[PDB]
Each structure stands twice: as C-alpha cells, then as structure tokens.
Design a protein around this nucleic acid. Sequence first.
RNA 1: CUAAGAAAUUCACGGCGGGCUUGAUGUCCGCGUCUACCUGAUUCACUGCCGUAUAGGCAG
Lengths: 335, 306
Amino acid sequence: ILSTASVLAFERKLDPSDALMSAGAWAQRDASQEWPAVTVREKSVRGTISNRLKTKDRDPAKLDASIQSPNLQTVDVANLPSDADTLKVRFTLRVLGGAGTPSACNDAAYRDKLLQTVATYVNDQGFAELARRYAHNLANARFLWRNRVGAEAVEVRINHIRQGEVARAWRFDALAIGLRDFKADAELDALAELIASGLSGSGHVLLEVVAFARIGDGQEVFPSQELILDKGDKKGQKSKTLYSVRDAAAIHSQKIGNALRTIDTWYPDEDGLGPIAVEPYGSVTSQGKAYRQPKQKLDFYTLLDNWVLRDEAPAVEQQHYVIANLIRGGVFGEA
Amino acid sequence: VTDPEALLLLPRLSIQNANAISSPLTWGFPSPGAFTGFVHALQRRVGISLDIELDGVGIVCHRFEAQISQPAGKRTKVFNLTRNPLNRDGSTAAIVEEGRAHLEVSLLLGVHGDGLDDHPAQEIARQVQEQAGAMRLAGGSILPWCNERFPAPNAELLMLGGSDEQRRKNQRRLTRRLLPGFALVSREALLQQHLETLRTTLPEATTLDALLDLCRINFEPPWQVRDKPGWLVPIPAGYNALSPLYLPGEVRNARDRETPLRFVENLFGLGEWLSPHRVAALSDLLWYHHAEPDKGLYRWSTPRFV
RNA sequence: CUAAGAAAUUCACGGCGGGCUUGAUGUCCGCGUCUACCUGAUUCACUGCCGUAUAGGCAG
C-alpha cells in the first residue's frame, strides 16, 4: 500500500558557517587577510513615543505627560571605522553529498521508493537548475541582506578549497547579478557544476565566500540580531543585541542559509516578491504570509506524497522545489 | 574495555553550534555520549573500510563559547534562540528553547586492528580527517580550516614504541600538541567516596545531594569557602532503563523497524576538567560505551583513569 | 549511527541643564655584596689578473 513514513528526517545539505564581518579600504581587498574585525559597541539612544495610540491615549494631556517622561534605551551598534569604507564578509560553505538520502526513515519500502524517485530526478536533469540558483545566490550578495542595500559596489570572491589551497577561484560583481533573475554565465555555470558535483558526490565540497561591500566611510553595518526573550523581568533590558563570535560582529549561519535558499520562484502566487526561501508551506517571515498553502496542491508534503506514493510526478519546477526542500532538510512524518 | 594499539589525534576541530543542553539538569559542554557516538559513526563510515576499530575518545576543549546572555537584574542566564519559519497560517510558531554553542576540540581516537599494519599511519589518519570533516559532533557543523595561516595535520602515533623513553617522549609531544585545553574525565569513584563521607556526616543522603554538593560553591562560617580538588562538573553518565525492551516492530513512530526500542532516562554522574599533563598515559582519557542491556545501564564512561 | 534530524529577531530613536572639594603636616635612625674566568671557534669567502662572459680558470 506504500504507507508514508511515520518518522522522516533529512540532513541539512549546503550548510554555511557564521559570516565574519571585518573592515578595510577599497582597492586593498587583495591584502585583506589582516583586516581588523568589526566590533559590536554600546551606545545610548533617547527616543520619543511614535507608535499608534489606542484611541484612549490620544488625549493631549496624557500624550504630553508621556512625552515628558524620557524614553531611554541601550542598543548594540556595529560601525565601520572612520577611515575604512569597505565591509568584508567571509564565511565557509560545505556542499555535502548524499543529497536525496534521508537521515531517518521508518519504512524500508518507502526508503526504496524515495531513493528511486531521487534517482529518477538526478538522472533526468540532476541538480543543474538547483545548483545554478544556489551559485547565483552565492554570486550576488544576498547573504549580506541590509548590508547589500546601499553599497556603492559589491564584489564576491569564491574560492574552492580542495586540500588546503585554492583549487579554483571565482570573482563576481554582485550588483550586476540580479536578486530575482537567474541568467546563465560561464563562471556561474562552472560554480553550478562544482556545487552539483558536491551535491551528487559522496563526500563534500568546501567553498569560502568573501564579499566586499563599499558601504561608506565609517557607516553603520548590520550583523544578525540575537533573539532573546524578555520573559517578563522587572528590570529594563537592552533593546538591541548584535551577534558576535570572538569580539567580531557576525551573521548567523541560518541567516546565510536562508539567503542561499531564496531560489523558489515556482510558488502559485505571483512573483512580485521574486524568489523566496525554500520551506515547507512556503512561509515568508518578512511577509507574514505562507504561500503554497495545503488547500492548493503545491505544498511540499502533498507534492512529495503524490510523487513517491501515487507516482503522480509533478511539474519539473515543482520537482525542483521538492528536491530543494530535500537539500534544506527538516523533521517530517505524521504520528 | 580494550587497550588501543595506537592513538589517533584528530586536530583542532572548530564546532559551530553544538547542543549546549547536555542533560535535563545540566548545561554547557556537550555530553560525552555525543563524542562517543561521533567516534562510533566514524568507525561505521570509514573505520570498517580501513579494517580498523575506532573506540575511545579524548576530549580536550581548546575553546568553548555558548550563545548565552545574562538579563539585567538577574544572576542566572538565558539561551539565545533562533527565529524559526512561520506556520502555514502565517503566525509565529511556539518557541522550543535549545542551547547552541561554539567549540574547538581535538580528539584522541583509540585505534586497534590490522589496518594499522595494512596501511600507512598518515594515510589512515588523513582519510579519517576528511571523513570527519563532513560530519557533526554535537548537533553542529565542523569548520574545516580553509585559507588560514596553516592547517593542523592529523597525526597517528603507535603506542608500542621502540623503547620506554621513546614512548614517554611521544606521549609528552602529543600532550604538547593539545596543550591549550583541559582533558575531560569521569569521577564515579570520587562521587561515591563523597557520598559515603556525606552519609557519615548525616544519614539518608542520596547521591544526588552529593553530586550537588561537589559542584555548588559552599560557604562555611568561621567566612571561608570549601575548596574543591578540581573543576568537578556534573555530567550525564548514560541512560537507565525505564521500560521493558520492546521488539523492533512494537513501538509506534520509531526511528526504524529493525532495532529494539527501550524508553530510558538520564543518569547523572561526576566529571572533571584537568590539564593533560596530569595523566600518566593519554589513552587513560578515552571514553568508552558500556551498555549491559540486561539491566539497562546504557552508560558511557572513561575507565582505567586512576 | 552524536537529547539524532530542522530554523531570518527586526523595523525606528536628541540624554542634558548647573556646580569652588578645600584647611594643616619632620619619614627615620643603622648597614662589608663578595669570590673565581681564553670570546673564538679556519668568524676577513678577501685583493688583483686571463677571458665579452654572470661560462670557466689564474696570481699572493
């Protein structure tokens, strides 16, 4: 009957490291191994109430009384030095093999059928499109996020590390490569071939990704913010806390992974957003809305179940979406 | 349970986000069960192909860093979390708190078999290194040291030296390699001795109270502090049986249907962090599995230490 | 076969108004630092000549 597995899990393929942030001057990007790190500092901010009022605080006397109480906060801030205009973001990326193999799965017939489905996908077209989109997300500085917004020029340098040295080196102009269009380029095709060979291999392929963004002299950079629950403590806390590994501002690994996963342009809604991160039930945290709802037949679980159990193979784009979810991983399976 | 013919020093491994939730009652460094399971996975993946056996692990913790913060006005600590993806209806999911930490460790793997004579030591050490370079140690990825000043090579040393002086020099140089760190050992005998001392101090005292007393900072009036022999962390010592051993197909929603499943619960023991110079041989730091499936007691420990 | 497997914290912010720290003061008596050594190991790979020569020889 080929019942679906009660416990299903997939290992996270294509896992990056923390994006270390460092600062320097442009046209010295080559000798950037000794660039000083960007440090997270402390500063005091005094604001004023600017949020919406609930029709009972709109009395002028209460508003003036609440303004007369100073609103003080302590925030973590990260800045470029007052003589450095370039932010260097460096992280390491492992492209693991055994991409379609589940990490944990109950039913052995479901094992054979799922591995047969992945084998059909890989010998039909393989990871050609998926690794193309991942290499595009590497080539443009999507992992900088807000650091990519107002940069004069962004250059991404990607090096293949085989044993301890650069086997093959890439250099891209991130602002020329779009954040929503996946064209074809020769160096991009070479990077896609390397990533696809890593996904189809039995070991791993190591890449280091170094992006230089010309933010501005002494401007304010944006490391990943840390999620800390207040938990109803009586003392006032610092409102903003930035992430750092060793006295050096950094971006979270899952933030970089979410940036790399932004390849899904096949969701049923219109591509006004463009690509979105590959997730089950197509959730977008910034938009607060989950595309690929299960009421439509385009969510990951129903597509996978139709593909592997009832042999209802979806469209090629939906097959790419399902295999991209397999790259992403996750804990699956009903009770 | 056995004497290794050689020691395999996995070099400084940068572990990114390790599970800082070691046990239901302890936090911080990951459980030794994670390291023993990682070594067993190394044996299951590459150890069989090399005709060797990888049993025993030495944990040194060259660097530790947990993603924690201390709220203002509180002396305790909280764990920094991650923003999970939204639900299918666009709302924030319920937060499940997990602790994630940064490690830098080097592992001493006990090697015994015929592949040591069948293959060169550098070759098997290397192949184990690039096998471990695509794995996980405590739920976190392993950073493989690309484009730094110089990577640390893997080094396998046979314990059967040509002489006692040569063996002693090799042990001291291997200790010098993993110097900025602290070896992790288990202190079950010390915990029992302290429990007997506590029982002579006052009766009906359980070993939980002895374990708590050996880790807390005690203040005594004339105001002094009761000194501790070492670092004396509380560590999970294994798993104890909580249910009769079920057949592989009895338990619904198991990991597989080929392995028996038994419900367990954590066993908490005593551990110590100490400098590697204070051990007679580096093979005394190796952590081994001790299952004994008849009575439960699915334990990991480091025997032959003292 | 690792309390296994999975994860975007994030948008915005004026901390400043002002101020006499001054009064007085003994550091101090005493003291054995000795003894004994190869800097030098080829430690000046130097000056000139024949030859276009960095190729290669020769002179004290």
